[PDB]
Write a protein that binds this DNA or RNA. Structure first.
Ligand SMILES: [Ca+2]
Ligand SMILES: [Ca+2]
Ligand SMILES: [Ca+2]
Lengths: 350, 993, 209
DNA sequence: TGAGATTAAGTTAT
DNA sequence: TTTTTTGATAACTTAATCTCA
């Protein structure tokens, strides 16, 4: 009818095609408007489009709108808004589709992207310098090219002995198992969770160039791997008893009662971050507790919060204790409540 | 024109647009007034001061306050205050449509703007000042400003209203009559001119009658006019031609009638007359404008109203006449299956008659205040003045051989075949007349009989007009809705509130600009409570709230401008903190906090806050509606003349209707009163109120002379100012020992079962319980009333139940009524020989279980004996009563291939006779003792609706027997023969939930 | 046919059988009186299947005495309605070839007339002569179409009643209007993208001239 | 070898 | 030949679905 309706229909058409990369929630409401004004429309109310350069081994995600995973609906947060810091390659340079970022040991890397031609994608990668997949424009071709991170292949255009967990970052411990003296690429816990491998047992694992790769089981995993090594997502994490050190490390500020407040006030960006997010969310991010498990644990509890401070937490439903991750997290809940109290006091003082 | 009373309002859709006014003086003359009409805009001083034309006309509207009403989720306690702008918006009139940038105070069409800018009640009488009035034509007095011309208003007066109750009888050869091939036969008019001179006309078309018949009629005292000018208005029968009849019809219609009334008229009658007139003569009904400037060439337009989760035909004349149709109005009020002329007459005209004399066929009846209460006898006599067919005992219809109305009743002499007893039910039901066969062989005697039938049809339209009080209804609608009289029965609840809402806004000087993307969440939660058990056999007391939803809407001030914020939480580590913040920052008796169900799935708690400081638009609109209904319903208790029903009887009904839809409008998305949080809070508080009432009467003991309520008496929302003592000081007789158990509760109704069985004790107990509940249980404006004593309560389902209604007046020996709330009896789904059997079985079980045995099982054996008498014998079709087998099933619209998948429903063939979307339908679907179950819904379609069926057939039978047995086994408990009930015939086992 | 003596096509097969019966009731009187279109613009737009004209335009006024049958077909450009449509098309695109704009010669667009015949200077008057035929005639178009172009605004308000099946349709302001409220915003390209929403090729309104 | 759980929707009642 | 449309849900009812085959 009017220009607004034309714009609405154009954007409906635009988001209809780019639905597997999510917008999809608002897409249903878009169909609702169309089914009324025109009495019907041509449409009805989480993986890469088929399409398809070595694979940067890790956790792969795709983003095109402005980060969902092809394997499942895994859209998590990003450090310091890297996606917006890189502007929008999709909008600025049309032709590329579902730009792919791979995370490897808390380091974000970009793998090969599908366009047009790969030349413009490589030029954009050079312009916005994060990393490069390779320069092709399993022990040959890709073996000649060297990099600090493992790479195997997209295209070109054994016996274990014991268990030893590694360490990457702050309270982050990637899984690792030693074979008959190499580390098996089992950094993804779910693959280890879905396939529990007993130690000192032959396992069907294949090595291409550098390394090899393939509730009751979760109890065995939590008991064997250092006891107090819970699941914080794709990796493991220890209890990590700490006070202001973790708060300073996460906020990227100098270690410091009034000293911390003065340090926060000195940096405007950190002050905005503090007064731009809820206390619970930032505390959970600082301690690295998984969002899914911690929400369930909190919902299944009977806190006695007074004056925005937890006094004596307790558990009510024992069923949630079936998951070993919640058991370990509930064990270190005192650290979380202390850090939450400290954060609330700091924000009240500010 | 000195003092003249307004009759209709309208406007001219010409090159220059004028808003007219038709009025009647104290004499019998029509006075027309004309005014200029403009589009109205209330933009601010900064949008119209900068435009190509200067202000053509402006008014000092005043400093208007605009509040932005919006709802936004807040995962915190930081809520920004509502932005209010006080400015100097000017009331601007422009004779042409301009697209202004501001566009404030929208969603008002054109007319309420005029009515409130100037100030006019669309129904009423005014002293039209001659200072401004100019004789622009013959009788049309046009003046410029409609503002000071109506400075003084006076009480209304009984004008000599003019009525044209017209009904035409056509040739129904085999299908529905059409304007192209079916000639008109028997146009009848109940012409009531401006002299109190009722004139009944039954003009027969002479192209069908022969010379002998018309000569005999003339000898009997009839006419054979050949021109329009020679017709006599004082006669009672005419034998005119088709073209002359159409010319007479055009002359009558073009006249400045106050009302032209029909039944199925706009769709059929008036359209038929018009289309026939232009088809035969070539003349067109030119409704001259009041100032004689615009010719309309009458054409009836169709208006469609459909709900996302109805076609009405209307007149387009612009001369002040209020052309009306009764079919559409009838299919708008209450809820009943009577949607046909004969059915409505049967349901409306009834009385009791005593057989004072018998005979071979003549059974004289008598009707007066002795047999019936009052009024119905007089109405029966009035219909009998032209009626000649009366239905007795619901199945016998006899032609009235002789009639005589002496002073207050009738002396009808029927053709009954020596009926037994002494007292019978005399009602104007349908007639044994076969219209198609009557028109098949058309002779003089049949012509006179059809003339009697058609004049009775016109007078019956008049009698339905008087019974429904349609003129009162139209006047009340005009007065309430601030609308022209021609538009009172074609606007739904969304637009009918705009007038009063606009008046309220202009009195309060608020615009309430609504920004885009306010709310989109689906709906609010609800709950239904199951009863305790399926058998009571004791007295059950019914308590009902007084318009609970409007009452809570005014209690909580649930308005979008009073909405502060919806604080929502996703976990419990923050829910406690923000809950404490809400409790400590918002004092209770200025902000109401409602724990509505969370709007988003990932939320566990949602609290909506409403500011009860300044009254909102909804709590003031419905308050005004309630006050108006209360004030306009007490006048009928004081008025003794015809005004008691002529004026002061439909105002309260219309105000009740408008108050009973405010809550529904408050949740409707694109409405002027939409507020999602308000609907959520209203529903939540209603559920809290029903829970509070139920769990205070669940186990209340009437020990000695006091009642101990179940739980404490505390306000379910905040800390009110009521006592919490559950014991009361009721004044029942001290020798009482009863226990109350709260069994069932609907939105505003609560049932409590009692140990007693006699009616009088239950009535007194319930009355004093009701008088104690409002004093102690309820608070503020929440009032309750005792409906009736429901003994023999049987909760057939969660909501469906059958009882024996006993009001606060019907004590013991008073004849009871089986008033129910959704059981088989009230629901239309049931059919013939289904309600009587279950009625008898339930009545037997009443005294079977009142004494108390818990082991008597003879009910099943007695039911088997009663059913086996006719269960096998009914298998012969024997002309089964099709007239009462079906249900409220209409020609449905939403379907894929067939609604309720079947053979030819919705899709269907030969269904001409009154078949369309929205019409209640009656129809029917050598192998006796049918075997197995074959999903018995075989022949379900929409075909020609008749009242006859074949015979000598052994067709299978429907859910009658199975449902009777299912209800019976729901009443009882033993399933010893449950399989054997239908294993031989169908094969199944009752659910017995 | 009894009045004005069909050559039914395979496309309009389930329509003509009831169409003749509906027509015969009116043809006894409408045909006798003179009408603005020639007594031929009744079944001319029936030949050939309608399996590719997925955009159908309908109008209620079959022009004054200089009628043409299908709407917007007069090769004179003097028509007020045709001139404004062509001006809007030129504004949107900018084609200089002017030989008479018409919405009929398109590989995927068919023009339709709401009322097949109307009298000289008598618009909106034939709300009863063609009322029954119109519903059945529009039913077949509704059965298979992508979008329907209705112009007339409140003139075409009563269209859901004649809409037997749910389809995509748009009701636009007529070129006459009241304050020339047609060139301000028409949003024609919506239909040009509507076919895209139904996985159908968009139609540029410049094919054939 | 009868016992159940949404459809497929309506279907009446505050 | 010109301004105009409509209240959300909660549930009992019959429906075959079909295979144990
Ligand atoms: Ca009639
Ligand atoms: Ca009639
Ligand atoms: Ca009530």
């Amino acid at each position: 009818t009017s220009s607004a309706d034309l714009t609405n229909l154009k954007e409906l058409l635009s988001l209809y095609k780019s639905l597997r990369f999510s917008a999809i929630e608002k897409y249903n409401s878009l169909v609702e408007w169309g089914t009324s004004t025109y009495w019907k429309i041509g449409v009805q109310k989480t993986s890469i489009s088929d399409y398809y350069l070595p694979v940067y081994f890790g956790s792969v995600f795709i983003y095109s709108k402005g980060m969902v995973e092809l394997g499942s609906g895994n859209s998590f947060q990003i450090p310091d808004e890297i996606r917006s810091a890189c502007n929008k390659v999709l909008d600025s340079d049309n032709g590329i589709d579902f730009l792919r970022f791979v995370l490897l040991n808390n380091r974000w890397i970009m793998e090969d992207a599908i366009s047009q031609s790969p030349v413009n994608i490589f030029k954009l990668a050079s312009e916005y310098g994060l990393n490069i997949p390779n320069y092709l424009e399993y022990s040959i071709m890709e073996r000649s090219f060297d990099d600090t991170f493992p790479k195997i292949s997209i295209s070109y255009i054994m016996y274990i002995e014991s268990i030893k967990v590694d360490r990457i970052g702050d309270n982050i411990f990637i899984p690792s198992v030693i074979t008959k003296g190499k580390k098996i690429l089992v950094k993804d816990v779910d693959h280890l969770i879905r396939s529990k491998v007993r130690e000192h047992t032959f396992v069907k694992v294949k090595k291409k160039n550098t390394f090899s790769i393939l509730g009751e089981v979760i109890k065995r995993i939590i008991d064997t791997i250092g006891r107090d090594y819970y699941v914080n997502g794709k990796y493991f994490s220890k209890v990590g008893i700490a006070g202001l050190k973790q708060l300073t490390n996460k906020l990227d500020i100098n270690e410091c009662v009034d000293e911390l407040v003065d340090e926060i006030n000195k940096s405007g960006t950190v002050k905005r971050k503090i007064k731009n997010q809820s206390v619970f969310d930032l505390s959970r991010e600082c301690l690295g507790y998984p969002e899914a498990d911690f929400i369930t644990l909190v919902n299944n509890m009977r806190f006695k919060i007074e004056n925005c401070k937890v006094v004596n937490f307790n558990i009510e439903n024992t069923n949630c204790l079936n998951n070993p991750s919640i058991e370990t997290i509930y064990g270190n809940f005192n650290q979380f409540v202390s850090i939450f109290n400290t954060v609330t006091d700091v924000k009240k003082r500010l | 024109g000195m003092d003249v009373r307004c009759i209709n309002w309208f406007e001219s859709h010409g090159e220059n647009r004028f808003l007219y006014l038709k009025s009647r003086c104290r004499n019998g003359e029509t006075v027309f007034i004309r005014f200029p009409h403009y589009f109205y805009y209330v933009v601010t001083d900064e949008i119209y001061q900068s435009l190509s034309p200067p202000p053509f006309n402006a008014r000092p509207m005043g400093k208007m306050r605009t509040i932005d009403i919006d709802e936004t989720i807040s995962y915190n306690l930081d809520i920004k205050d509502r932005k209010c702008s006080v400015a100097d918006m000017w009331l601007i009139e422009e004779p042409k449509k301009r697209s202004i940038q501001n566009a404030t105070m929208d969603e008002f069409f054109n007319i309420s703007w005029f009515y409130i800018s100037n100030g006019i009640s669309p129904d009423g009488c005014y002293s039209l000042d001659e200072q401004y009035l100019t004789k622009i034509n013959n009788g049309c007095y046009h003046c410029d400003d409609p503002r000071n011309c109506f400075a003084k208003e006076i009480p209304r007066f009984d004008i000599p209203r003019s009525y044209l109750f017209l009904d035409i009888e056509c040739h129904f050869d085999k299908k529905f009559p059409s304007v192209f091939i079916n000639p008109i036969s028997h146009t009848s008019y109940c012409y009531i001119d401006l002299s109190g001179k009722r004139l009944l006309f039954t003009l027969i078309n002479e192209e069908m009658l022969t010379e002998q018949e018309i000569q005999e009629a003339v000898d009997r005292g009839c006419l054979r006019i050949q021109s329009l000018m020679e017709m006599d208005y004082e006669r009672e029968l005419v034998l005119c031609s088709e073209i002359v009849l159409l010319r007479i019809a055009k002359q009558l219609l073009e006249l400045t009638f106050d009302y032209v009334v029909t039944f199925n008229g706009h769709n059929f009658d008036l359209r038929y007359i018009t289309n026939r007139l232009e088809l035969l003569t070539g003349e067109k009904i030119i409704f001259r404008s009041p100032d004689k400037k615009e010719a309309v060439h009458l054409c009836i337009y169709e208006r469609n109203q459909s709900s996302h989760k109805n076609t009405t035909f209307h007149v387009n004349n612009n001369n002040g006449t209020i052309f009306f149709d009764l079919y559409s109005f009838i299919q708008k009020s209450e809820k009943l299956d009577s949607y046909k002329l004969d059915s409505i007459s049967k349901n409306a005209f009834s009385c009791m008659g005593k057989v004072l004399n018998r005979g071979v066929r003549e059974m004289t009846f008598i009707g007066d205040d002795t047999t019936d209460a009052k009024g119905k006898a007089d109405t029966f006599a009035k219909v009998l003045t032209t009626g000649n067919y009366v239905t007795v005992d619901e199945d016998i219809i006899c032609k009235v051989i002789r009639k005589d109305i002496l002073e207050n009743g009738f002396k009808v002499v029927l053709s009954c075949p020596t009926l037994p007893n002494d007292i019978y039910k005399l009602s104007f039901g349908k007639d044994d007349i076969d219209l198609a066969q009557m028109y098949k062989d058309y002779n003089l005697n049949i012509a006179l009989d059809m003339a009697r039938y058609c004049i009775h049809d016109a007078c019956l339209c008049q009698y339905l007009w008087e019974y429904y009080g349609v003129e009162t209804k139209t006047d009340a609608g005009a007065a309430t809705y601030v609308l022209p009289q021609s538009m009172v029965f074609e606007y739904r609840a969304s637009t009918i509130i705009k007038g009063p809402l606009l008046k309220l806004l202009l009195e309060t000087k608020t615009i309430l600009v609504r920004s885009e993307t306010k709310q989109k969440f689906p709906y609010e939660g609800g709950k239904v409570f199951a009863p305790k058990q399926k058998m009571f056999s004791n007295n059950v007391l019914i308590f009902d709230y007084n318009s609970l939803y409007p009452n809570v809407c005014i209690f909580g001030n649930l308005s979008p401008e009073t909405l502060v914020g919806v604080v929502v939480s996703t976990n419990r580590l923050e829910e406690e903190i923000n809950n404490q913040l809400l409790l400590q920052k918002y004092p209770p008796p200025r902000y109401i906090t409602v724990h509505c169900e969370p709007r988003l799935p990932n939320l566990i708690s949602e609290i909506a806050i409403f500011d009860r400081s300044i009254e909102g638009t909804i709590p003031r609109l419905l308050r005004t509606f309630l006050a108006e209904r209360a004030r306009y319903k007490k006048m009928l208790k004081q008025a003794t003349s015809s005004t008691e029903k002529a004026i002061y009887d439909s105002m309260q009904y219309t105000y009740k209707i408008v108050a009973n839809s405010v809550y529904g409008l408050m949740g409707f998305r694109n409405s002027a009163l939409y507020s999602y949080a308000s609907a959520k809070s209203c529903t939540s508080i209603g559920r809290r109120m029903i829970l509070y009432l139920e769990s205070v009467l669940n186990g209340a003991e009437l020990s000695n002379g006091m009642l101990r309520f179940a739980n404490t008496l505390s306000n379910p929302f905040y800390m009110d100012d009521r006592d919490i003592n559950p014991i009361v000081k009721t004044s029942l007789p001290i020798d009482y020992r009863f226990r109350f158990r709260s069994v069932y509760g609907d939105t505003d109704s609560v049932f409590t079962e009692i140990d007693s069985q006699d009616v009088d004790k239950s009535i007194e107990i319930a009355k004093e319980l009701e008088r104690l509940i409002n004093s102690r249980v309820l608070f503020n404006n929440f009032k309750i009333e005792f409906e009736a004593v429901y003994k023999n309560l049987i909760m057939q389902s969660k909501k469906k139940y059958t009882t024996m209604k006993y009001s606060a007046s019907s004590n013991s020996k008073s004849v009871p009524e089986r008033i129910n709330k959704g059981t088989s009896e009230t629901r239309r789904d049931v059919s013939k020989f289904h309600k009587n059997m279950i009625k008898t079985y339930k009545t037997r079980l009443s005294e079977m279980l009142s004494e108390g045995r818990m082991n008597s099982n003879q009910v099943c054996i007695d039911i088997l004996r009663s059913l086996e008498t006719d269960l096998r014998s009914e298998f012969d079709s024997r002309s089964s009563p099709l007239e009462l087998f079906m249900l409220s099933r209409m020609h449905h619209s939403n379907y894929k291939s067939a609604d309720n998948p079947n053979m030819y429903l919705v899709t269907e063939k030969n269904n001409p006779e009154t078949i369309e979307l929205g019409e209640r339908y009656y129809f029917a679907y050598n192998v006796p003792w049918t075997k197995k179950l074959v999903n018995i819904k075989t022949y379900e379609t929409i075909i020609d609706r008749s009242f006859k069926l074949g015979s000598n057939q052994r067709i299978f039978y429907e859910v009658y027997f199975k449902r009777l047995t299912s209800e019976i086994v729901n009443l009882l408990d033993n399933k010893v023969l449950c399989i054997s009930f239908f294993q031989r015939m169908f094969g199944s086992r009752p659910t017995f939930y | 046919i009894s009045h004005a003596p069909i050559t039914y096509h395979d496309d309009w097969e389930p329509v003509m059988s009831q169409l003749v019966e509906f027509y015969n009731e009116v043809a006894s009187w409408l045909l006798r009186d003179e009408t603005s279109p020639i007594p031929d613009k009744f079944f001319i737009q029936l030949k050939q299947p309608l399996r590719n004209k997925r955009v159908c335009v309908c109008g209620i006024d079959p022009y004054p005495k200089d009628g043409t049958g299908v709407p917007f077909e007069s090769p004179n450009f003097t028509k007020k309605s045709i001139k404004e449509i062509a001006s809007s098309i030129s504004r949107l695109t900018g084609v200089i070839d002017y030989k008479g704009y018409n919405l009929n010669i398109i590989d995927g667009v068919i023009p339709w007339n709401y009322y097949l015949s109307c009298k000289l200077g008598e618009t909106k008057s034939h709300a009863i002569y063609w009322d029954k035929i119109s519903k059945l005639l529009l039913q077949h178009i509704t059965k298979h179409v992508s979008v329907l172009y209705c112009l007339g605004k409140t003139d075409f308000s009563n269209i859901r009643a004649k809409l037997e099946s749910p389809v995509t349709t748009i009701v636009g302001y007529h070129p006459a209007a009241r304050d020339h409220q047609f060139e301000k915003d028409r949003s024609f390209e919506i239909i040009n993208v509507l076919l895209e929403l139904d996985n159908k090729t968009p139609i540029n309104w410049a094919q054939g001239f």
